[PDB]
Design a protein around this nucleic acid. Structure first.
Lengths: 509, 205, 85
RNA sequence: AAUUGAAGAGUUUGAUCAUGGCUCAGAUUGAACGCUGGCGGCAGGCCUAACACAUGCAAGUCGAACGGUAACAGGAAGAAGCUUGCUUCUUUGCUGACGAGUGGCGGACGGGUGAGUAAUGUCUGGGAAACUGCCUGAUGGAGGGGGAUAACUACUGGAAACGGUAGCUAAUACCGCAUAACGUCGCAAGACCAAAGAGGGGGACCUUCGGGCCUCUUGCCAUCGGAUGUGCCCAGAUGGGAUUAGCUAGUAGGUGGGGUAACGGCUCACCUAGGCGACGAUCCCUAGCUGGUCUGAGAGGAUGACCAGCCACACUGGAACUGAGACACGGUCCAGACUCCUACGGGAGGCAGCAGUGGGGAAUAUUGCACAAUGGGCGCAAGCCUGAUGCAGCCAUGCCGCGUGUAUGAAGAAGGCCUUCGGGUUGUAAAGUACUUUCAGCGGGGAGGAAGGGAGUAAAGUUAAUACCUUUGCUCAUUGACGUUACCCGCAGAAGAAGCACCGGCUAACUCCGUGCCAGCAGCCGCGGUAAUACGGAGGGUGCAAGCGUUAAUCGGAAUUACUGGG
C-alpha cells in the first residue's frame, strides 16, 4: 500500500462452472438485472466482470465459462481474485469438468466457498454432492476442513440470501486492507477493438484511485489515459480498488490476463515498451528456432503431405489466444491444421490479403467484415465465415480436414480371364485371345497379367473385343480378345486379373 | 563537439604541434614527433593531391578546434565577402573568442582557453559570454571578469604568457586581465604556415 | 442544422412568402400592362402605365424588385407605349 | 557599398589514340529504415483512401428594437407564524436583470482540402457598358394613420423527433395615405417613389402628474460624392501527344422582342450563311497555377508542401430562396448512395474545423491550456463569444549552439597487438598528481510580452440647463494564458553525458588469424579454388559526430538533345 492510509477494499469474487448450473443465471439473480440467461450459445463463450448492486455492501463478480478451449482464460479469471466461489448442481454428483475447475482454484491458492445451486428441484440431493466431494481433496464441509457449503437455487431462481451473506462473511474474515489515496494498479480482464473509440480494454484496478490524467503501462501497451468508461455508469474519472473499468486510446491491443501499473512519465514508458518489443522479438526468435529442430523439416517429414490453413480474428484478445490453441489441438499427423495471422477485431484489407496470397479459410468469431475487406472479397471470394458458436467452428475445421484427406483404399477383383491362341495386330503389337473364367470384365479398370504368383505384365485394360467387335463389357464363359499398347509378350495359359478400385474417403476424428 | 582523445596523436598525424601542451617539454621528448602516427605509420611518407588538401584542412580545423560542418559555415561566409576569400577565412578562424583568449595567454592552451570561456569567466564590452564561437570585433575591449578573477587556473597561464609570441592584432594587458582588439589580423601575420591558396581550392574538388 | 440557425430558417421562409406575393402582384400587373400594349389601345395602355408607375417604384424602394431593374422597366414599357401614342 | 564566376575521375584493348555509353565523388529532402544517442535554441512535422467515423468542442450577439416573467437576485407593499422589530410567507416588473420568444445585424469572413480543372482557369498588361454591405464627407427631410401574428393562455396528437385546433398581445417587424428633386422615366409639361424611433438628464409651461415640452446623444430616410469590394471584356504568355486531321445548329453573324446590377446568343423569334483549322483546331492522356522554392557558373532544368496572392471544391447529383453579398465548409429543398436509432408506427447524419479513432501505407503528432496579448463577430460601452490567434505537449526530422573536462604526467606501467624476438606499437593515452565546474543535478532570486480598459476627479467644449454627456488632461484601484517564463545568484563534485561508417583501385586510411571459388563481399571495374591489404574475426588506421550510414527522390557533374554550347 503506497499511500499508507489503507482501508479494506470491497471484495473481488470469481465464479467458475459450466453447462447451465445456474451458471449464467446466478450472477443475473445477484445483480437482479433479468438477463435471464437469454444470450446466444446456451451459456456464454467468453469472460466478463461485473461490479454489483447489493446490500449491506458492494462486491465485484467475475465470470468465464470453464469449457475445454478456455484453459488459460479460466486460469486468468481464477488467479487475480480475492475469493473464488465454485458452483455445483444439486441434481446428482459432481462432474469431471467441475473437479478440473476445482484444480484451477487450488493451484492458484485462493480460499474457496461453495454452493449447492439447484436444491428446490424435486430430484435434487445436496447431501449426495456433500458426500461425493467428501471423496476428494476439495476441503469439503465438516467431514473435511470446511470450505462452507450453501444450499440455494439459481437454475430455478430462488434466493441466494445465505450465499450473499457467506461471500461477505469470508471477505470480512479475510484481511483486505488496501491503499485508497495513493497510486493505481491492476489487471486486464478482457480486451477488444472499437472502430470509433480505438483499441479498448476492461481493466480491474486492484490498487485504488486511477485518476483522469495518469500514465499507464500494461505489458507492451503504454499511454496516458484519455477517458474511462463503465457499464454500471458511463463516465468514470477516479476509480476504486476493486472495480472493472473500460480504458480507451492506446497504441495496440493490451494483453488480457496481466498487469497494468501507473508510471512516472510517458517518455520512459515508450522506452520500456520498446524494450518489451525487443522481448517480443526474443519470443519471436524463440518460436522461429523451435520449429526447425523439432523434426528436422521446415514442415512435414513424410511424402503423403496434407495441411489446412486458417486465418482467425476474434473480437476479444483473450479468446483469440485460447481458441486458436484448441484448433491446433484437434489435428492429426496426416492432415495438419495451422493458424496463419491471428487477428483481433474486425476483418480488414490486409487480413483478406493473407488468405488470398496463401490458401486458408478466413473466419472471425463475433467479428465481421468491413469495407476494405469487402473490396478484396468481391474481387476474390475466399472462404468467408463470420460465426455463431465455437463448437460448429471446431466441427467445420474438422470437416475441411476430412475433405482435404486422401480418399481411396480398396482393391477388389471384378474378373479373372485365361489366355489362349495369340494373334498379331498393328494396333497393339500382339492380341491375346482370352476366355473369361470367372467374374465380369469391363472396359477400363486396372489389370494384372500373372502366371503362378508373378506379374508377367502390367497395365490398364486397353481393348475389350468379343467375337469381332469391341464392346463395353464381357462376363465369364465368353470368348474375348485383348491387347495392350506395347504388349508382345503372350504366353498361353497366363491369367489376367481385372480388378475394381473403390474409394472410401477417410474422416478425421 | 570537442575532440576528447590523445592530443599527441593529432600532432604526429598533422606533422607539428598544435600547442596542446605547456612547452616545457614534449615537442621533442614525449611525443615521438612525426616519427610515426600509428602502428604501421613508420613506413609511409607518400601522399596524394586529395590527401595534401585534406591534411591542411585537418591541420587548420585541429588548430582552431572546429568541426567540418562549422568549418564549412566559415568557408561559405568567407565566400560572400568582398576581399580575399582565403584571407577572410583565416580572419574568421582567428576571430574566435577562445582564440583571442589563447592570444592573450589567459588560457595556456586553446582547450584551457575554451574551458575559461565556457565557465562564465570572460566579459566582452561588459557583457558576459559563455559561447565559444563568439567573434571579437574592432574596438572590443575583452577581459576576465572581476568576480573570481585570477584564480590558480589563470595564474599558472600568466607565466608562459610573459614570453612567447605576443603580436599586435590585439592590445594585451594581462595585469588586470584584459585586452583590446583594435586592428584586424592581416595576411603577413599568419600566412605560409598554412597552404591557404590550396585550402581555398579544395571544396571545388 | 445543429446550431441555433433554426431561427434563420424560419426567417427566410416568411419573408419569401411575403416577397413572392408582392412579386406576384407586380408581375400580374405588368402583364396586364403588356396586354394593352399587345392590344394596341394607346389610351388603355397609358392608363395601365399610369397604374404601374407608383407600384413599380414602390417595390423598388422596398428593394425586392430592385432599383435599376425597376428603372429599366419604366424605360422599356415607355418605349412601346409612346410609339403607340 | 549592390556581378569573385564554371575542375574531374574510373571503366571497352596485348598495348594506343578516338568515338561512345555506363558508373562515382557534389549539393538537396515535409523522408524512411538501420545502429547508436546528453542538454539547449529556432524552424518544420499524413505527399497514401475527396475512405468512413464514436464522444466532446469550433458564432453568435443586442432588454439602449419589443411583448414578457420562464429565470433568480434584491426591494417594497401586504398577508401572517413572531424573533415582537423584524424575521417569515403569498402578491407586485417596483428594481439589477434575463430563458424561451419576437424583431435587427452577424451566419457569404477567417479555417480546411487539391478531387474535378490545360484555360471558361491562372499570370502580366490594357479596357468599358457596371454594380458595390458596413464605413465617411456634403445637402435636406424625419408628417399623419391602420391592420395582423408568433410567443403567451385554454383544449389536443405524439415512443421520440416533432406538432395540431381557437382566441388574446407589442415592435426600429408588416401595410396604406400625406409629404418629394438636384432622382428615376420623359422632348418638355408632368407623373411617382421615404420616415423609426430609441436613450440620458433638466429650469420654465403645466400634465388623463404616465409625463407634455426643452435640450444633448444616437439611430431611421432620400440624393450627389469618396475610398473599398466585386462582376464584366479584350490582348499576349501560361502541360504532353499527329500511331488525335478535320472541327462547329445557337454553331457564326444581323435585326427585333425578352432577360441581367450591367456589356453580351445572355435567351427567344425571325433573317443571312458563315465560323474555326498546320501560328496545331478537335479529341485523348495528364495537371491546381503564379509571386517563389530547390538545383545550376550562367544560360537552363526540376519543383509549387512551407509562406502569401488567386482560383476551385465542401457525403454523390441538381435547383432555387433569403440577403448588400452565396447558387451558401458546421443554411434550406429535393433526388441519390450509405449509416444509425426506435416503443417498429415513424424519426435522425455528413470531422477535406480542432482534437481523436478505425482503415490505408515505409511513414508524419496531444480526445492539452487561455481569451492574458494580437485580429475578428455583435454591442454605445461594460460585456460576451473567438479550436482564428497566442501558447504548451509529442518526434535527433532539418538547421544551428554547446557539453560529454582542463593542465601536468615515462617507469614511455601492465595488458592487448605485432615482433627478423633486437624490439616496436597501442600510448601522455591510461594510472598517478595538480586544477576548473559550463551545461545538467539541487536550493534561492526575477525582466518583458501591459499598451489599455474600468472607477474616481478636474479642465475645456457643449446646452435654456452650475445641467448632463462626450472629448482632453490628472489621480487611484487594477488587468499575465504561457508560468516551476526568458534571465540572474548560491552550493557540492570529474562527478551525469560518444557513437557510427570505411580502409584493392576509385578514395583519405594495413597487418595478422580463420574460412578455402565454400561461406560471402559488390555503387563501379571486381575480390575468394590455404600465405585473401577486397570474405569472417581481431589488432591498427582514417573520416565524421549526437548523430552516423544505407535506401528512395531531384537537379548536378552531362557541351550525354549541344540557345549560350554538338555531330
Amino acid at each position: 500500500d503506497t499511500g499508507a492510509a489503507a482501508e479494506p477494499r470491497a471484495p473481488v469474487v470469481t465464479i467458475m462452472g459450466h453447462v447451465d448450473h445456474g451458471k449464467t443465471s446466478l450472477l443475473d439473480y445477484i445483480r437482479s438485472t433479468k438477463v435471464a440467461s437469454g444470450e446466444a450459445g446456451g451459456i456464454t463463450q467468453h469472460i466478463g466482470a461485473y461490479h454489483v448492486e447489493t446490500e449491506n455492501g458492494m462486491i465485484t463478480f467475475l465470470d468465464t465459462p470453464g469449457h475445454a478451449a478456455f484453459t488459460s482464460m479460466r486460469a486468468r479469471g481464477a488467479q487475480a481474485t480475492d475469493i473464488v466461489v465454485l458452483v455445483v448442481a444439486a441434481d446428482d454428483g459432481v462432474m469431471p469438468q467441475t473437479i478440473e475447475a476445482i484444480q484451477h482454484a487450488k493451484a492458484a491458492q485462493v480460499p474457496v466457498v461453495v454452493a449447492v445451486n439447484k436444491i428446490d428441484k424435486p430430484e435434487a440431493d445436496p447431501d449426495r454432492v456433500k458426500n461425493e466431494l467428501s471423496q476428494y481433496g476439495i476441503l469439503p464441509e465438516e467431514w473435511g476442513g470446511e470450505s462452507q457449503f450453501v444450499h440455494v437455487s439459481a437454475k430455478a431462481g430462488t434466493g441466494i440470501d445465505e450465499l450473499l451473506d457467506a461471500i461477505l462473511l469470508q471477505a470480512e474474515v479475510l484481511e483486505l486492507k488496501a491503499v485508497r489515496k495513493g497510486m493505481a494498479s491492476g489487471a486486464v480482464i478482457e480486451s477488444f477493438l472499437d472502430k470509433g473509440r480505438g483499441p479498448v480494454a476492461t481493466v480491474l484496478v486492484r490498487e485504488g484511485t486511477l485518476h483522469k490524467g495518469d500514465i499507464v503501462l500494461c505489458g507492451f501497451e503504454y499511454g496516458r489515459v484519455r477517458a474511462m468508461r463503465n457499464e454500471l455508469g458511463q463516465e468514470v474519472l477516479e476509480a476504486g480498488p476493486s472495480i472493472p473499468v473500460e480504458i480507451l486510446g492506446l497504441s495496440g491491443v493490451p494483453a488480457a490476463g496481466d498487469e497494468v501499473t501507473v508510471v512516472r512519465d510517458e517518455k520512459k514508458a515508450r522506452e520500456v515498451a520498446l524494450y518489451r518489443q525487443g522481448k517480443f522479438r526474443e519470443v519471436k526468435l524463440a518460436r522461429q528456432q523451435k520449429s526447425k529442430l523439432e523434426n528436422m523439416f521446415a514442415n512435414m517429414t513424410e511424402g503423403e503431405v496434407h495441411e489446412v490453413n486458417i486465418v482467425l480474428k476474434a473480437d476479444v484478445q483473450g479468446s483469440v489466444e485460447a481458441i486458436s490453441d484448441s484448433l491446433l489441438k484437434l489435428s492429426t499427423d496426416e492432415v495438419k491444421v495451422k493458424i496463419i495471422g491471428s487477428g483481433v477485431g474486425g476483418i480488414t484489407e490486409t487480413d483478406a490479403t493473407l488468405a488470398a496470397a496463401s490458401n486458408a479459410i478466413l473466419v472471425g468469431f463475433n467479428v465481421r467484415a468491413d469495407a476494405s475487406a469487402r473490396k478484396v472479397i468481391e474481387a476474390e471470394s475466399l472462404d468467408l465465415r463470420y460465426y455463431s458458436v465455437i463448437y460448429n467452428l471446431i466441427d467445420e475445421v474438422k470437416a475441411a480436414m476430412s475433405g482435404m484427406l486422401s480418399p481411396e483404399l480398396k482393391q477388389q477383383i471384378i474378373g479373372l480371364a485365361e489366355v489362349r491362341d495369340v494373334f498379331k495386330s498393328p494396333k497393339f503389337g500382339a492380341i491375346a485371345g482370352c476366355m473369361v473364367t470367372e467374374g465380369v470384365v469391363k472396359r477400363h479398370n486396372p489389370i494384372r497379367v500373372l502366371r503362378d504368383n508373378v506379374v508377367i505384365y502390367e497395365g490398364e485394360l486397353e481393348s475389350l473385343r468379343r467375337f469381332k467387335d469391341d464392346v463395353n463389357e464381357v462376363r465369364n464363359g465368353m470368348e474375348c480378345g485383348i491387347g495392350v499398347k506395347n504388349y508382345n509378350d503372350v504366353r498361353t495359359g497366363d491369367v489376367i486379373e481385372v480388378f475394381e478400385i473403390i474409394e472410401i474417403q477417410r474422416t478425421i476424428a | 563537439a570537442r575532440y576528447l582523445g590523445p592530443k599527441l596523436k593529432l600532432s604526429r598525424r598533422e606533422g607539428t604541434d598544435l600547442f596542446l601542451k605547456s612547452g616545457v617539454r614534449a615537442i621533442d621528448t614525449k611525443c615521438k614527433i612525426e616519427q610515426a602516427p600509428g602502428q604501421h605509420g613508420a613506413r609511409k611518407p607518400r601522399l596524394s593531391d586529395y590527401g595534401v588538401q585534406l591534411r591542411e584542412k585537418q591541420k587548420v580545423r585541429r588548430i582552431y578546434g572546429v568541426l567540418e560542418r562549422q568549418f564549412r559555415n566559415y568557408y561559405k561566409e568567407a565566400a560572400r565577402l568582398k576581399g580575399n576569400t582565403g584571407e577572410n577565412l583565416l580572419a574568421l578562424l582567428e576571430g574566435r573568442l577562445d582564440n583571442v583568449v589563447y592570444r592573450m595567454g589567459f588560457g595556456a592552451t586553446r582547450a584551457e582557453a575554451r574551458q575559461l570561456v565556457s565557465h562564465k569567466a570572460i566579459m566582452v564590452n561588459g557583457r558576459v559570454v559563455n559561447i565559444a564561437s563568439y567573434q571579437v570585433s574592432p574596438n572590443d575591449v575583452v577581459s576576465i571578469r572581476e568576480k573570481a578573477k585570477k584564480q590558480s587556473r589563470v595564474k599558472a597561464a600568466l607565466e608562459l604568457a610573459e614570453q612567447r609570441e605576443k603580436p599586435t592584432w590585439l592590445e594585451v594587458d594581462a595585469g588586470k586581465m584584459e585586452g583590446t582588439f583594435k586592428r584586424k589580423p592581416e595576411r603577413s601575420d599568419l600566412s605560409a604556415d598554412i597552404n591557404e591558396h590550396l585550402i581555398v581550392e579544395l571544396y571545388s574538388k | 442544422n445543429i446550431k441555433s440557425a433554426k431561427k434563420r430558417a424560419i426567417q427566410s421562409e416568411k419573408a419569401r412568402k411575403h416577397n413572392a406575393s408582392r412579386r406576384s402582384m407586380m408581375r400580374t400587373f405588368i402583364k396586364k400592362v403588356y396586354a394593352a400594349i399587345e392590344a394596341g389601345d394607346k389610351a388603355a395602355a397609358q392608363k395601365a402605365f399610369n397604374e404601374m408607375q407608383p407600384i413599380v417604384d414602390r417595390q423598388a424602394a422596398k428593394g425586392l424588385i430592385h432599383k435599376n431593374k425597376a428603372a429599366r422597366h419604366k424605360a422599356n414599357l415607355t418605349a412601346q407605349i409612346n410609339k403607340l401614342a
